[PDB]
Design an enzyme around this catalytic site. Structure first.
Site, PDB file in Angstrom:
ATOM      1  N   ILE A  40       5.626   9.383  45.330  1.00 20.77           N
ATOM      2  CA  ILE A  40       5.249  10.780  45.030  1.00 20.77           C
ATOM      3  C   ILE A  40       4.173  11.236  45.949  1.00 20.77           C
ATOM      4  O   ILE A  40       4.220  12.384  46.419  1.00 20.77           O
ATOM      5  CB  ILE A  40       4.872  10.978  43.536  1.00 20.77           C
ATOM      6  CG1 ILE A  40       6.119  10.881  42.647  1.00 20.77           C
ATOM      7  CG2 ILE A  40       4.143  12.344  43.294  1.00 20.77           C
ATOM      8  CD1 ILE A  40       5.810  10.977  41.155  1.00 20.77           C
ATOM      9  N   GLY A  41       3.215  10.361  46.216  1.00 26.64           N
ATOM     10  CA  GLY A  41       2.123  10.654  47.134  1.00 26.64           C
ATOM     11  C   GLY A  41       0.861   9.864  46.859  1.00 26.64           C
ATOM     12  O   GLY A  41       0.803   9.099  45.900  1.00 26.64           O
ATOM     13  N   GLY A  75      -3.025   9.289  45.699  1.00 28.32           N
ATOM     14  CA  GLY A  75      -3.994   9.832  44.757  1.00 28.32           C
ATOM     15  C   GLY A  75      -5.344   9.853  45.450  1.00 28.32           C
ATOM     16  O   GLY A  75      -5.446   9.495  46.632  1.00 28.32           O
ATOM     17  N   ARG A  76      -6.413  10.248  44.732  1.00 26.71           N
ATOM     18  CA  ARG A  76      -7.776  10.195  45.281  1.00 26.71           C
ATOM     19  C   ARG A  76      -8.045   8.690  45.549  1.00 26.71           C
ATOM     20  O   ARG A  76      -8.610   8.310  46.575  1.00 26.71           O
ATOM     21  CB  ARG A  76      -8.725  10.774  44.235  1.00 26.71           C
ATOM     22  CG  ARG A  76     -10.168  10.971  44.666  1.00 26.71           C
ATOM     23  CD  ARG A  76     -10.957  11.712  43.585  1.00 26.71           C
ATOM     24  NE  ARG A  76     -10.360  11.570  42.248  1.00 26.71           N
ATOM     25  CZ  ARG A  76     -10.541  10.525  41.442  1.00 26.71           C
ATOM     26  NH1 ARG A  76     -11.343   9.527  41.804  1.00 26.71           N
ATOM     27  NH2 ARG A  76      -9.934  10.476  40.265  1.00 26.71           N
ATOM     28  N   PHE A  77      -7.557   7.837  44.624  1.00 23.16           N
ATOM     29  CA  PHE A  77      -7.491   6.393  44.720  1.00 23.16           C
ATOM     30  C   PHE A  77      -6.062   6.054  44.283  1.00 23.16           C
ATOM     31  O   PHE A  77      -5.487   6.764  43.471  1.00 23.16           O
ATOM     32  CB  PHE A  77      -8.492   5.709  43.759  1.00 23.16           C
ATOM     33  CG  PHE A  77      -9.933   5.909  44.161  1.00 23.16           C
ATOM     34  CD1 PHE A  77     -10.535   5.073  45.086  1.00 23.16           C
ATOM     35  CD2 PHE A  77     -10.667   6.976  43.662  1.00 23.16           C
ATOM     36  CE1 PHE A  77     -11.861   5.283  45.485  1.00 23.16           C
ATOM     37  CE2 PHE A  77     -11.984   7.197  44.075  1.00 23.16           C
ATOM     38  CZ  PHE A  77     -12.568   6.350  44.984  1.00 23.16           C
ATOM     39  N   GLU A 135      -1.800   5.054  44.678  1.00 23.61           N
ATOM     40  CA  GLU A 135      -0.549   5.600  45.172  1.00 23.61           C
ATOM     41  C   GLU A 135       0.256   5.965  43.949  1.00 23.61           C
ATOM     42  O   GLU A 135       0.331   5.178  42.997  1.00 23.61           O
ATOM     43  CB  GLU A 135       0.160   4.464  45.934  1.00 23.61           C
ATOM     44  CG  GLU A 135       1.058   4.807  47.102  1.00 23.61           C
ATOM     45  CD  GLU A 135       0.506   5.736  48.161  1.00 23.61           C
ATOM     46  OE1 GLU A 135       0.874   6.930  48.128  1.00 23.61           O
ATOM     47  OE2 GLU A 135      -0.247   5.271  49.047  1.00 23.61           O
ATOM     48  N   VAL A 136       0.900   7.113  43.978  1.00 20.64           N
ATOM     49  CA  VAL A 136       1.693   7.617  42.867  1.00 20.64           C
ATOM     50  C   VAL A 136       3.172   7.475  43.132  1.00 20.64           C
ATOM     51  O   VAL A 136       3.640   7.747  44.250  1.00 20.64           O
ATOM     52  CB  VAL A 136       1.297   9.063  42.490  1.00 20.64           C
ATOM     53  CG1 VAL A 136       2.004   9.527  41.228  1.00 20.64           C
ATOM     54  CG2 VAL A 136      -0.219   9.173  42.312  1.00 20.64           C
ATOM     55  N   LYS A 155       0.740   5.275  38.702  1.00 18.93           N
ATOM     56  CA  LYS A 155      -0.300   5.254  39.701  1.00 18.93           C
ATOM     57  C   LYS A 155      -0.692   3.791  39.884  1.00 18.93           C
ATOM     58  O   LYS A 155      -1.017   3.090  38.891  1.00 18.93           O
ATOM     59  CB  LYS A 155      -1.474   6.118  39.287  1.00 18.93           C
ATOM     60  CG  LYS A 155      -2.507   6.186  40.409  1.00 18.93           C
ATOM     61  CD  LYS A 155      -3.206   7.543  40.555  1.00 18.93           C
ATOM     62  CE  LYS A 155      -4.054   7.906  39.381  1.00 18.93           C
ATOM     63  NZ  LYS A 155      -4.836   9.157  39.630  1.00 18.93           N
ATOM     64  N   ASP A 191     -13.224  17.699  38.376  1.00 19.70           N
ATOM     65  CA  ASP A 191     -12.380  17.880  39.548  1.00 19.70           C
ATOM     66  C   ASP A 191     -11.169  18.786  39.233  1.00 19.70           C
ATOM     67  O   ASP A 191     -10.010  18.530  39.624  1.00 19.70           O
ATOM     68  CB  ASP A 191     -11.969  16.536  40.156  1.00 19.70           C
ATOM     69  CG  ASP A 191     -11.298  16.682  41.511  1.00 19.70           C
ATOM     70  OD1 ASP A 191     -11.579  17.689  42.215  1.00 19.70           O
ATOM     71  OD2 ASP A 191     -10.495  15.793  41.874  1.00 19.70           O
TER      72      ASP A 191
END
Length: 301
Positions: free
Chosen positions: A14-15, A17-19, A21-22, A35, A136
């Site tokens: 999916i992409g 994350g801030r930390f 991988e999704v 995640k 955030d």
């Protein structure tokens, strides 16, 4: 052996994350979002698992958390967070792809305000819920469900309040969050980070920016604005704290409210909410509960 990650098959990236991988995974035949963090990101994974396991957190406008787990592939350990999957993805993606009707805009804004009011609200009792501030909030951190309503996601940077002592569960660091959406008091470091109410007020400023993004996409008689991030007209794509502070704190600018928003009652109500989220003084801003109330009255009328 375990019974969560062991039974999930990753299907599509999916992409980032801030930390972590999704991924889109399959669990018991259903799509789920996963995640995955590495061993050296354990603090980030543990804190996000801790926030999502908060007592009484579940709500239709907060991302549904399923489980935290570990998966050892035979070489390294993966740290997993599994949640509900929403095909539309983020509100940012949805607003880039589509225009919305007046009803569509109100559904997105009311659901966001309802989720924020739930996050911000303390629920008393044996199974009580502490008040939580997001820190955030942005259109990339809100997801759109199949029914056209939103749920707040990416709670990893949140803080929780203990009301009896007016203390916060972690020692908050300055200027966590996405710089473009940081409140004026966060940008100039005047925020009192020992005061939990300060974090709720900073979230409201950011929600005001998200409402502006949604309203640009509200198409009436085929008329709408192109998708833009807040401050697209004043700062670079990945702005620094200093670039944002010069615009928001020193020049005292906010996103422009187009003249065409005055010709529609729903857009007039939205534009007034935005101005009342954007005050430089956090104490003057609307609360999420007040916004939810105003928007509920608008959805009804």
């Amino acid at each position: 052996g375990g019974t969560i990650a062991r039974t999930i098959v990753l299907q599509e990236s999916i992409g980032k994350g801030r930390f972590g991988e999704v991924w889109r995974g399959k669990w018991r035949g259903e799509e789920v979002a996963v995640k995955i963090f590495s061993s050296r990101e354990e603090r980030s994974w543990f804190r996000e698992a801790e926030i999502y396991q908060t007592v009484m957190l579940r709500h239709e406008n907060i991302l549904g958390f399923i489980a935290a787990d570990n998966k050892d592939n035979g070489t390294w350990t993966q740290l997993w967070l599994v949640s509900d999957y929403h095909e539309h993805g983020s509100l940012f993606d949805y607003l880039n792809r589509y225009t919305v009707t007046v009803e569509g805009m109100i559904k997105l804004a009311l659901s966001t305000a309802s989720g924020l009011a739930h996050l911000h609200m303390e629920i008393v009792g044996t199974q009580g819920k502490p008040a939580i501030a997001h820190r955030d909030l942005k259109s990339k951190n809100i997801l759109v469900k199949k029914n056209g309503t939103c749920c707040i996601a990416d709670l990893g940077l949140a803080v929780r309040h203990d009301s009896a002592t007016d203390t916060i569960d972690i020692a908050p660091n300055h200027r966590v969050g996405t710089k473009r959406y940081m409140a004026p008091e966060v940008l100039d470091d005047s925020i009192n980070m020992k005061h939990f109410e300060s974090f709720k007020r900073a979230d409201i400023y950011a929600m005001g920016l998200v409402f502006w993004e949604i309203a640009r996409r509200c198409s009436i008689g085929g008329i709408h604005e192109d998708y833009q991030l807040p401050y697209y007209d004043l700062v670079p794509s990945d702005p620094s704290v200093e670039e944002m502070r010069k615009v928001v704190c020193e020049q005292k600018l906010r996103p422009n409210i187009p003249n065409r928003w005055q010709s529609c009652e729903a857009l007039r109500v939205m534009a007034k909410i935005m101005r009342e989220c954007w005050y430089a003084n956090g104490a003057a801003r609307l609360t999420a509960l007040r916004i939810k109330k105003t928007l509920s009255q608008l959805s009804q009328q």
